[PDB]
Ligand binder design. Structure first.
Ligand code: VRX
Length: 559
């Protein structure tokens, strides 16, 4: 029951890979400790293969089946529809990996004949064949981090034609099934603000609150064939068209359960018997599986008034404390149950009695104050990785602008406002590209967003208070201060001086650019403005922004 079997062939890159942080004339204005930033490459692929390769053992008890039965009952109320080839094509990212059959992403979005014809042949084959493993490509992810160096993560994905087929049969399912089965526990249905709200209300709903995050060690690798088949049995509970049931069964048997691994050179690298990270059901499957195992584990551990929040492989549990020693015992029992379910922890879980100290989804709840001096809760995170990626994007253009996504998700934070907003708006001003739409990701989905709409986006998602937060917590202030010293980022006085310049320039620009200066940089000036609700700013269609997770799903949503 090994997660992977290897042949010995190496995981090759598709081109040259840079490990050192690229430097240009703008780098030093953001940070000076360039040696602290690096990017993972295929050169470390071997190290990752060792960590992700191991034998899995599963002991499934009654709690597990009782939870699965309840999950299935809820899934049976779901009615999903098949997506036409056209609709599926439109969900394909403009920069999605080209097919090895004579066409690319652009060809798919344009609904070219060759692309559409090939997609129809793949679909037909899925209906006719339900046993032949489908080929997948394995690549070493190139991600930017700050030294503490971690090995590159592994990405496994099927051909573009197959991906479009996954959308046709499962897009509607993975988009609606999760919330129905897990209810309020499904994390991707919440925007950052609503997530905070849910956590805070949950924490206050307990007499003596106790919470903990559970970090599964290489979750994808802990996912067994049983887990993948159980997920399928849940999808099959929905009301689906016969053709959709057939495709789902075929995709599960031939793709989700496992398959051969081919490198960028076309060589056989090995065989996968666990979760593929680059398929449409990756986020939905991991979420359902984590929720199932964790729910059963909560019962085995006999936790009191248990409330969970699950986002893919990320999990947070808040319950009623029964004392320090008792909680420590309940946690060990939880971890033992999870281990039996094939979900061992990377780092032993610890009980927390302070909400702000619980980190889930690489984030945590913190508190600040608005203009009225009223306490306001918001979502934050350690800014180390966001700033490292910002430094990289400062000297190199990339498919996804993490800085943009971070400003949107973390607009209320001290670091996003002082540094990210200031630094990038300065750059956009100098290049006169304020109106140039840029791609970023939100819950795994790719979006094309115009920087000039940030004020409206921020007010809608975080409220006007996001433009006037002050008096951040001691812990938050210290974490940010720590990051700035580690990377060598200029102090507040410097960013304030720069923000004043950026603000003045935006104001003169008038229109949306003026709104950006007024709201985004109101913290810069000494005599803050009243900050009245933004005028005509409610046109963007943000309805599908926080519906579900799509990490690795190759999903693109049009604004
Ligand atoms: C990292 C070191 C550091 C610098 C500044 C702080 C703490 C701060 S700054 C602050 N308010 C100011 C303000 O003018 O309202 C502020 C400054 C910068 C920003 F991007 C937002 C808000 N309230 C706090 O508690 O910590």
């Amino acid at each position: 029951h090994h997660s992977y079997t290897w042949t010995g062939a190496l995981i090759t890159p598709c081109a040259a890979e840079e490990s050192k942080l690229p430097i240009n004339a703008l780098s030093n204005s953001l940070l000076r400790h360039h040696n602290m930033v690096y990017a993972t490459t295929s050169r470390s692929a071997g190290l990752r293969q060792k960590k992700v390769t191991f034998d899995r053992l599963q002991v499934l008890d009654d709690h597990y089946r009782d939870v699965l039965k309840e999950m299935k009952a809820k899934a049976s109320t779901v009615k999903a529809k098949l997506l036409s080839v056209e609709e599926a094509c439109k969900l394909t990212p403009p920069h999605s990996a080209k097919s090895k059959f004579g066409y690319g992403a652009k060809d798919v979005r344009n609904l070219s004949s060759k692309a559409v014809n090939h997609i129809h042949s793949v679909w037909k084959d899925l209906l006719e064949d339900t046993v032949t493993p489908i080929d997948t490509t394995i690549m070493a992810k190139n991600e930017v981090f700050c030294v503490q160096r971690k090995p590159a993560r592994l990405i496994v994905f099927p051909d573009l034609g197959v991906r479009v087929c996954e959308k046709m049969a499962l897009y509607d399912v993975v988009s609606t099934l999760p919330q129905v089965v897990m209810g309020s526990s499904y994390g991707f249905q919440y925007s950052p603000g609503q997530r905070v709200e849910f956590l805070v209300n949950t924490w206050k709903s307990k007499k003596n609150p106790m919470g903990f995050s559970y970090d599964t060690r290489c979750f994808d690798s802990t996912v067994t064939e049983n887990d993948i088949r159980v997920e399928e049995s849940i999808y099959q509970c929905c009301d689906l068209a016969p053709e959709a049931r057939q495709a789902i069964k075929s995709l599960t048997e031939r793709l989700y359960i496992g398959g051969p691994l081919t490198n960028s050179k076309g060589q056989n690298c090995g065989y996968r018997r666990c979760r593929a990270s680059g398929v449409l059901t990756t986020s939905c499957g991991n979420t359902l599986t984590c929720y199932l195992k964790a729910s059963a584990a909560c019962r085995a551990a006999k936790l009191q008034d248990c409330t969970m929040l699950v986002n893919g492989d990320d999990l947070v549990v808040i319950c009623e404390s029964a004392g320090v020693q008792e909680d420590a015992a309940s946690l060990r029992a939880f971890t033992e149950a999870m281990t039996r379910y094939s979900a061992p922890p990377g780092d032993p879980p610890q009980p927390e009695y302070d909400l702000e100290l619980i980190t889930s989804c690489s984030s945590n709840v913190s508190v600040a104050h608005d203009a009225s001096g009223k306490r306001v809760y918001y979502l934050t995170r350690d800014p180390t990785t966001p700033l490292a990626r910002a430094a990289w994007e400062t000297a190199r253009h990339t498919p996804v602008n993490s800085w943009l996504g971070n400003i949107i998700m973390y607009a209320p934070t001290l670091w996003a406002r002082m540094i990210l907003m200031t630094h990038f708006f300065s750059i956009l001003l100098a290049q006169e590209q304020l109106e140039k739409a840029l791609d970023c990701q939100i819950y795994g989905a790719c979006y094309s967003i115009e920087p000039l709409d940030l004020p409206q986006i921020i007010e809608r998602l975080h409220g006007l208070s996001a433009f006037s937060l002050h008096s951040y917590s001691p812990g938050e202030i210290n974490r940010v201060a720590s990051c700035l010293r580690k990377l060598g980022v200029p102090p507040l006085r410097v960013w304030r001086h720069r923000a004043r310049s950026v603000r003045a320039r935006l104001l003169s620009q008038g229109g949306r650019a003026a709104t950006c200066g007024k709201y985004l940089f109101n913290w810069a000036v000494k005599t803050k403005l009243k900050l009245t609700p933004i005028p005509a700013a409610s046109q963007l269609d943000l309805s599908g922004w926080f519906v579900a997770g799509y990490s690795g799903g190759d999903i693109y949503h049009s604004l």
